[model samples]
Target: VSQEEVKKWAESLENLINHECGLAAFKAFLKSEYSEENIDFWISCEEYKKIKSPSKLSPKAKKIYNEFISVQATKEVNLDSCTREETSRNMLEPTITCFDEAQKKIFNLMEKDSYRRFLKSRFYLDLTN
Candidate 1:
C-alpha cells in the first residue's frame, strides 16, 4: 500500500531532495510560489549539520536560527512556538541537531505540500520522462 504510493512519487521526491538538477528545478518551481525559502532553509540545515568544529557550530547555528528561525527574519521558516523556543535554548550550546526539529518540520512541509504538486508538474514530468 505505502509502497505503491512510494513508487508513484518516489522518483520525483527523491530527485527533488537528493539531486542538484532536481533541486534546481524544484527551487525554480517553489520560487514561482514565493516559497523558495523552505527548501533553502532545509538545505542550509543540511549543510549546517556537517560542521565538525565546536567553534564553527555556535556561529553557524546562530546564523541559521537568526536567518530562518528568528521572528521577522529575512527568510524565516515556519516553526512551532515550542520548537522555536527549544531551538532558541539550544543556541546557547549549539549541537549538530539543534535545528533538527525545525528542519524536519520544513522537510515534512515540502514533502506534503510541494512534493505532491511536483509529482504532477510539467517540470517533474519532463525530467522523469
Candidate 2:
C-alpha cells in the first residue's frame, strides 16, 4: 500500500475492522505469515455478536469458544488466562456480549500487532509501489 493508503488504514480502526476490502488484504498478508488465526477469531466474534435467536446463541458461542478460545484449540488466538476463563464462564448463558472481553483483546492484538506489521509488509509494499 502507498503511504497514503497505509495512513488511511492506520487512521481508522473501524475501517480496518469492518471494511471487507481492507480486511481481505490484511488477511492475505496474515495468511502468508501463518497468523491468520488472529483475524479469524476476531471475525468469528463479530459474527457471533449478530446472532438474534436465543436458541442459536449458545451453540454458536460454544463453537466459537471451542474453535478459537479453548485450551490448545486448533486455531486459538493469543489470550490471557483471565479472559479465557471469563469466556468459559460466559458460555453458561451465552449472550451477545459473551465474548466481548476476549474479542476486545483480540482486536487490540490485531490493531497493535498484525496491523503494524501489515503496514510494513511486502504484500502491502508491493501493492503500493
Candidate 3:
C-alpha cells in the first residue's frame, strides 16, 4: 500500500474510534498504545483510496456509521418504557440501564489512557460485531 492509502486508513480508524467514544479517548489510546512512528507508518499505506464522500468508506465503517445514525435519530425511543421494571419488574431494561449507567460513570471517571481503550472496546470494536 502507498503512503497516502495508509494515511487514509489511519485517519479512518482514528475517526471511527473517535466517533464511538470521543476525541479525547481516541487520542489517549493512540498515545499510550501506539508510538508516533507506528501511527505514521500505519496511516501512510496508500492501498485504499481516499474517501471523498461518506459513501466511499469501507463496508464495516459504513455499517457502523449507519448504526450510529440510527441510534442518534431514534435516541429518544422511550427509555422510560425500557425501565428495569415493566409495571416495575423487567429483565432487559435493568441490564440496559446498568450498562448505560456504567458507561456514563466510566466516561466521567476514566483517565485519558483508559478511556481510549474503553471507546475501542465498547463502541468501535463492539459495534463492528
Candidate 4:
C-alpha cells in the first residue's frame, strides 16, 4: 500500500479509537459490515479516495510521509523530538505505536503466519528502499 493508503487507514483507526471503540469492536464491525476478503480492498480504496480528494492535513502528512518513504517502508512520525516528547508521550501521539499497529493489522489479515517473517524482514533491512 502507498503512504496515503496507510494514512487513510490510520485516520479511520484514529477515529474509531478516539471514539472510545475498542479494536475488537472495530474488527467485529469490519467483519460484520464487509466480507473478510474485501477488508484490504476497502481499506485500500478508502486510502486512495482520501489521496484523491485531498484534505487540510494532506500537505503536512504528505510531507512527513514523503520524507519517511525515502528512508522507511512505512510512513512514521519521529517520536524522539525532544521539544514535544512530553506532550507526545502524554497524548500517545501516533508514532511507533501507530506504525506498528497498522503493520500488524495488515499482516494479520493478509499473511497471518508470515507476520513474524514480516517483522523479521524489517529487522536489519535498510528501509531506505
Give the top-scoring candidate (lDDT).
2
Instruction: Give the Cα-based TM-score of candidate 1 against the true structure.
Output: 0.79
TM-score-superior candidate, 2 or 3: 2
How big is the RMSD of model 4? 16.6
Give a tens-digit lDDT track for model 3, residues 1-129: 233332332344444333424444455544564432222222321211243333333443333223322245332121232321231231212222322332233233333344345445644444333
Q: What is the C-alpha RMSD of each candidate to the true structure, in Å?
A: 4.6, 2.4, 16.5, 16.6
Sorted by lDDT, highest first, which candidate order results? Answer: 2, 1, 4, 3
lDDT tens digits, residue span 6-104, model 2: 567767666765656677787787787787887777777777777766678788888888878878787767888899898898778787777878878
Order by TM-score, highest first = 2, 1, 3, 4
Residue 109 lDDT, candidate 4, scale 0-100: 46
Any residue pairs clashing in model 2, and if so which?
1-124
- Where is the poorest 10-residue window by lDDT in model 3? 40-49
lDDT of each: 0.74, 0.75, 0.33, 0.35
Local distance difference test, candidate 1: 0.74
Q: Candidate 4 lDDT, tens digit per residue, 16-126?
A: 323333234344544543434334333432453355333433443344334432245243332333422332232333332323333344445434322223224432122
Model 2 gets an lDDT of: 0.75
Backbone clash total, candidate 2 = 1
Q: In TM-score terms, which candidate is top? A: 2
